[PDB]
């Protein structure tokens, strides 16, 4: 159920369409939370069969008890998970298996593609703050903005310094 | 088949047992590519059959073909993949549902759970490092032990940044 409280937390505001939630998460959301289109419509049909969302017609809204459901979850401490995969850490992992020559043409390929990805962040930065506050409306994105935005710069960061090490 | 390329990097250096490669995966490999312990024998015949490893008694060892796959595999550039899943960053992206005390505990427990994860990467970096070069044999393990200390450090600097703002 890996769309459970990503979709009681969109409606978290106020009522969504099924279309609404799906580009929810083709959009700002599934950066960092990707769904497959077809998971959506059975998850929300069965936060309905559960009493977290209920709908008029289709427009979807939270009930009291998805609200509160989406709060217990938000406020619960869990454990942080284990190391996210990276098919590339792997591959840097069995290092000795690459020439000098082929390590340095890796790295600098993942180094590229990073940059840029970092790019595309920065452009959605600005155009995001084009005076931050906690209860700000955009406070969310600009908390996952900011953290995707660190997490490319220092994977970047790390590249260059392996480069200036293998180079 | 998440297993493959995995394994045919843990033979890259020689012969290993199936307890051996096992042991790989509940120690340095399975903080960035977990297995399931169900997983690795399954894949391990996977690749006998396909010619890629084969054994002696049970020792495993890479065939030159084994040693091919593994090759093409490790210079092959691949698009970086979408944004791993961050459960607590779901939480930070509806963070308008959460009183301004309830999002300064939630963040305070992740940046001392990231802290703490921090100081235990920390340890083995120094242990490790009791003059790193290309082709020192543990620079893999370098590798992947710097990448997941910069990791960390830059989320606990990120959550650091985020409470001077919420408190």
Redesign the interface.
Known sequence: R?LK??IL?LL??GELSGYDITSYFKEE??????AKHSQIYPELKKLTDEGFITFRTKMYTLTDSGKQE??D???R??????????????????????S?Q??S??FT??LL??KA?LSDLQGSYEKLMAP????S?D???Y??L???L??E???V??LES?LA??D
């Open positions: 890996v409280y990503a937390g978290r505001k959301l599934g950066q960092f939370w990707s989406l709060h979850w938000l406020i401490h869990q454990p942080i998970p284990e190391t996210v995969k990276d098919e590339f850490m792997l591959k840097a992992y069995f290092i000795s298996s690459l000098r082929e390590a043409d890796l390929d993942q593609k990073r990805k931050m506050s906690f209860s409306p406070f969310g994105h908390l996952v900011t953290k995707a660190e997490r710069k220092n994977y960061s790390w392996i090490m293998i």
